[PDB]
Design a binder for this molecule. Structure first.
Ligand SMILES: OC[C@H]1O[C@H](O)[C@@H](O)[C@@H](O)[C@@H]1O
Ligand SMILES: [Ca+2]
Length: 128
């Protein structure tokens, strides 16, 4: 059921999980919750998501609470600015330390509580 895009396979889950249980599921399939590092990847993801909300690999790191990617892709604050839903990350209720794809737009990301359950997207490198 994995979908292929530019050197990576992607798994769009059928069952919802908390952010961490999702990441664990990805790790069990030799993958990680997806990073997003280009306009074309954002576009591939939100179109495939079809208007439903999916956990991606966005999570906070460091004392400053900077955003990071669980797959260890360095997070680029400048290049990622265009990918958030206007108003996000808003840190609602001071408890939104993980990120999902929510809106079917390039401006797609929302921060939400890590313990909420959503469908999720795994990303696995293809290695010829
Ligand atoms: O109003 C926007 C707000 O809606 C809900 O409260 C949650 O999804 C938050 O993550 C989001 O910031
Ligand atoms: Ca939010």
């Amino acid at each position: 059921g994995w979908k292929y895009f530019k050197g990576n396979f992607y798994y769009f889950s059928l069952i919802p999980k908390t952010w961490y249980s999702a990441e664990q599921f990805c790790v069990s399939r030799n993958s990680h919750l997806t990073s997003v590092t280009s306009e074309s990847e954002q576009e591939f993801l939100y179109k495939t998501a079809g208007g439903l909300i999916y956990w991606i690999g966005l999570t906070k790191a460091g004392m400053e609470g900077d955003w990071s990617w669980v797959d260890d892709t360095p997070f680029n604050k400048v290049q990622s600015a265009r990918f958030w839903i206007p108003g996000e990350p808003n840190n609602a209720g001071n408890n939104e330390h993980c990120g999902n794809i929510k809106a079917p737009s390039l401006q797609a990301w929302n921060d939400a509580p890590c313990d909420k359950t959503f469908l999720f997207i795994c990303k696995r490198p293809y290695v010829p």
